Amino acid sequence: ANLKQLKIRMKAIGSIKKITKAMKMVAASKMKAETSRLSSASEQASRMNAMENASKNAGEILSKLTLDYNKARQAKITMELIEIISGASI
Amino acid sequence: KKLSTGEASVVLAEKIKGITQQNDITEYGTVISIGDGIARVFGLTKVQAGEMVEFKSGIRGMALNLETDNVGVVVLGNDRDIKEGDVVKRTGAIVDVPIGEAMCGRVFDALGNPIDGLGPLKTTQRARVEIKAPGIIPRQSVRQPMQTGIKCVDSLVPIGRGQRELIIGDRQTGKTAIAIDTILNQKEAFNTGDVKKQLYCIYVAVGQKRSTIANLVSILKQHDCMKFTIVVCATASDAAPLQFLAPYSGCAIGEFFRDNGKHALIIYDDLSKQAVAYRQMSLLLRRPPGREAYPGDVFYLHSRLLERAAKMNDSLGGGSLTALPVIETQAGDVSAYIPTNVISITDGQIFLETELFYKGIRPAINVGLSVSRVGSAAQIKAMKKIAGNLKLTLATYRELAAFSQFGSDLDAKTQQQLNTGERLVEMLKQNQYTPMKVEEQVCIIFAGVKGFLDALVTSEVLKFEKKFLEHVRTNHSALLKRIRDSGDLSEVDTNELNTIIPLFIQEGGFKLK
Amino acid sequence: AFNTGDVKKQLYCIYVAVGQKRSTIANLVSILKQHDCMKFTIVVCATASDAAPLQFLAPYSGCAIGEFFRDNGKHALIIYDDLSKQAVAYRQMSLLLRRPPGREAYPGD
Amino acid sequence: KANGQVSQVIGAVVDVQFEGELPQILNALEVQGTQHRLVLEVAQHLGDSRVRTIAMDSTEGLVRGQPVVDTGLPISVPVGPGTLGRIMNVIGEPIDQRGPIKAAKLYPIHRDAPSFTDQATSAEILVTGIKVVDLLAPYARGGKIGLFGGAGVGKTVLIQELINNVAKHHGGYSVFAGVGERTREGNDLYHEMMDSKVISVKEGESRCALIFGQMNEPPGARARVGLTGLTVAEYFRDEEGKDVLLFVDNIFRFTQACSEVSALLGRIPSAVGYQPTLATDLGALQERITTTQKGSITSVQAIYVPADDLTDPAPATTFAHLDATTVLNRGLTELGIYPAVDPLDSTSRMLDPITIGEEHYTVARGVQKLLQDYKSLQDIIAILGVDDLSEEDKLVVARARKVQKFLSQPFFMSEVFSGIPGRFVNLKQNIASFKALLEGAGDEYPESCFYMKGDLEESLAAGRADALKS
Amino acid sequence: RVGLTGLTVAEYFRDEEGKDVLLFVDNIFRFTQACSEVSALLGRIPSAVGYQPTLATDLGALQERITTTQKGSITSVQAIYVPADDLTDPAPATTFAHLDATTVLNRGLTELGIYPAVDPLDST
Amino acid sequence: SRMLDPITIGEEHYTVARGVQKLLQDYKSLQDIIAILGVDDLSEEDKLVVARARKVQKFLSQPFFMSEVFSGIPGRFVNLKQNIASFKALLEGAGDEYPESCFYMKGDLEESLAAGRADALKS
Amino acid sequence: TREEEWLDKRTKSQEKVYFDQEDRKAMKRLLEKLNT
């Protein structure tokens, strides 16, 4: 399915997953500080949990898209090879 | 059926006439068809596979397909000269190329003809281009380093003599640059006279324009690194068979040194292009095409070549032939056909990234993917120790780089690791045509792993490198001499180094923080 | 423009239908007649039932009709319906002629 | 006297049967009885005194048994000043309608490339007036130049500007061979050169030759017209040590035409439908386009990248032959920046501190790092915003946007599109302008003033003027 | 055919000597790759992703001669290389069809100082 | 469908169909991000669109007579007028307050409202 | 299914807002400075 587009979409999700993972790290640090200081901490806790869930969901989608990219890659090799063989037969 | 190319009207007419005259069919041939640089020849029996043949005009050809009724030949030149009906005589000898010392410092064609114009080539004997690689017994363990001069390579991706290391990367990432940098470092031994270290270099150009080759030769003559290197050229204008033979011709020239106990290094540039030339010859011969239209034995083509780079045992002489094949990946994807083959053949690969090249990381070496099978066994005793710690730190830093943009928000002891990794990467950078001796590498890598660089500002790392080397080279010359002779970083030298480096950082004008 | 006597803006419209169901072209002609825009339009039809060579020549036939107006100081607008369908017909006509196929089985040219 | 005769006609490929003394390969055969001069280029000897050839014109109207004459030499075209200011065909026919072409002699379009010993390479900066090119990918007088672009990114407009900026005020002659491109563009260029007085009807003037093998021409013509233009330049170079400017409009069409007939010629298709001889066919042409001891040739060739896939075999193989490379990016067009020269992908063999000033090299590398760092930040900017970034990162983003907009330059040939007059930027001013931007000279002014401006001083004045206006 | 040669050496010990044999095979992917190359050379039309049509059969021959009998057994430990990290590739897929167990060596275990590299969870 | 035009079918029928398609397309343009991260950071209008699109997508489904053995629920035949009215009221926000489950496998909007009202009544 | 376009639009929009405000400030500050 136009492996070029799939790879672009795969690259985007990886950046999203990476940025979301980093924010979870930052949220843990900031949540620690507030609990030490102790609603603000609640905001940070929800953010940390939400980023974990988002990075998890992004990872699942990235794995699923990787399967499709490998599937598309095999088909492309097969299709090009068939063209070459059909031309060589005659 | 359809027809047979051997059933030509002229040949058939003779049979119908009944006159049994073949004008010495054996050792003589008559061209039946010519196209795209491939000539089919009726007759010419008793011709060995892979043998050279002479056409009426004078151009040679290689008998690659010995069929029942004809011979498919690839012409080694322009196809316009010879036409149908021409006579073909077998030379009687497989393709061979001259070898010797008198070749170092000369540019040659794929067949050994000097094109530089400096004069006639005077050599003793010639060697066959195609022969079998050494067995398992003649070989010996790779225990001797091949100093490229590149800090990143010599430290993290060591190359031992008799090893097959693949320089793989996208276009315009600095692959040919690494090859030339290696050649320059090997010049100190010839100038000094350390026969044990002398490494003759061989550069094979495949599918490259003659302009860049002339520039390449000028650089070698400029740096004087010529007179111990051999350049074999199969340019884009040269026929495909020549681009296919050049690597084997160069490998034979290197086997000369290997057999005699000398050490030689051979670099194949645009090795992937050689496969393209072979594919052309195969498709025009109507051989069954495989993936990406490459023949089935493309892999074989490369194996029998690269496997000829070996470290011969002390009985045969102890010689060696180190290979550095180059590969150009289109979209940085090594899952292609030719990359996978050459990766499976070679020991390790130096993977070059273009994004790193943009970010200012030159050489753009991705240490994550780059790997050497030989490993520490090649490095000198001094490097192995510090190099291990260096590899670990870079691995942790690449893992952490995902949070680089979030620096102050993250806690301490992690942002510190990020800062340390930056100093190292800056230290690993290097200029073009600036190879470093192994002793100087040890001092710099030592300053980096110990952590002294964390004081300086990243922008000043390279200034410290050049400036600190000048001081050590000037004052502490016995220290470097020991590292060079002994080959190991003794405890006393370690303490001496550990004391002067921070002292130099303070008295140095460069700022710190 | 045609209704009003301004010749410098009259534009004869040519519609070439390649590989389309005749029902679709009939509805289109009825629409044109409804708006009275058919008096200056030419419709060339090479439908799916028509042989592949017809679908291959229809665009070229229409273009020649347009060259008439072009060479005679007039202005013509030719609308080639899907040219992908013309390529399919050419591919079919060429493959059946035993000509070596290219990528996606289309002829080299 | 015609010895041969047509035996098989399929598409543009023609087989001929000869009675005796077959012609060497690449020779030109003339078919007799055609309303228009039809030439056939010998490509293969099939045996039985048969040759397979490619037609330069349409084969419609041919008939089996039609006599064919052997010229005994490859396609020869007129060379010399007689071609100056005149449009010529692939076989040398004048299509300008101004009469026959006067030539001292006829040279064949097929010849062996120059030797290695007579390569005579030399590096000398070529001021094109385009700041992005002059800065990031300098051009070398006497070296090949490539413009890689997809469909509608502006490589045709760029060729016109180079002509306007370089062709004029150039001591030597210039050649323009347009292969495969559209005919409408050809008419525009001819009229533009006439208006610009680069070519004229008055003899002894018009220092430029034109060759056109446009789309309408069948395969084989688009595959050999490039060689025709190159042959004219080789005469101007060898016979007179005069600097020559060779402008090749898309060369990708050259390999495309070859592949269109490769199948009918009998070759097996390659990976992406191209002929097996792509590299060698292309290299035979590139090696001839080079500077030598006698003279120098500065070749500017446009490579069309189908679907914006730089991994296609044709442009991928061409990359190796080029000294300077200019990659046009489509994303910039969406942003409005013109020219859409990818600053990072574009490379030049001349981008060396020894060849060019160290300051020039330093300035270029700084720009590349700045733009690359900005591209890396875009991802997190999407999620967090510019506000949450640090001052350092904010300054990087601000300065990079200004630099990227400042890279845009309005050319004369582009006025009709934009409506702003073209501008020419010298090398010194260009380097200083970008050097100042790096130091923060313009971090005060709005980024809008650094758009379609020539020099930094012009941009700063416009910013100050807009303030007094409001 | 080198793989079959080693297999034959082991079959002697199994049948005549009657003892258990252990057949190590350098990554079977190269065996599969070599078979693909001979098929192409022979002119056979390639299969899905460039492999030979006889992938299953060429691979099944070797894998079936490896079994337990009344006299002895041949236990095979073979290396697996996954091209492009695609488990769904024909070669590793047709191979996994035969594997009874998998031993996965992990680099992290080496770093920790444990030097059986096998992973308990990934191994099955 | 070629039949979908304001002249052949009523202008009301066409507007309702285009509104449904626009609603569904807008929701479809947001499914990727909603999958990666929830709808909380999503705007208020976009969240209303998401809720309404789920309702409409569920309401599109209907039980068939021939499929009665599979599901076990009686099939429904929906007249054209009832269909248009149901979707018009749904776009206007009639059943937005109720849960989306009441629209699953329902014949007409009134059936879904009665089930939704009973669910509101039970609690 | 296009997440890359979403990020690109997000990036462009936020940059434009922030730097449009900066352009306002820069015109005002330089105008104040040019008048004297």
Ligand SMILES: Nc1ncnc2c1ncn2[C@@H]1O[C@H](COP(=O)(O)OP(=O)(O)OP(=O)(O)O)[C@@H](O)[C@H]1O
């Ligand atoms: N260590 C380096 N530091 C700075 N610039 C470098 C360095 N190495 C290479 N460059 C530059 O990167 C470019 C590539 O050089 P080089 O030809 O050696 O690589 P390449 O990949 O083989 O190119 P090609 O694809 O044409 O063969 C050149 O412009 C070179 O000047």
Ligand SMILES: Nc1ncnc2c1ncn2[C@@H]1O[C@H](COP(=O)(O)OP(=O)(O)O)[C@@H](O)[C@H]1O
């Ligand atoms: N400097 C420019 N400024 C504004 N618009 C441009 C500029 N260059 C090109 N355009 C547009 O790009 C298009 C031309 O692209 P072109 O150079 O012809 O590429 P190609 O030769 O592949 O067709 C035109 O629509 C033209 O209006």
Ligand SMILES: [Mg+2]
């Ligand atoms: Mg190179």
Ligand SMILES: [Mg+2]
């Ligand atoms: Mg163009």
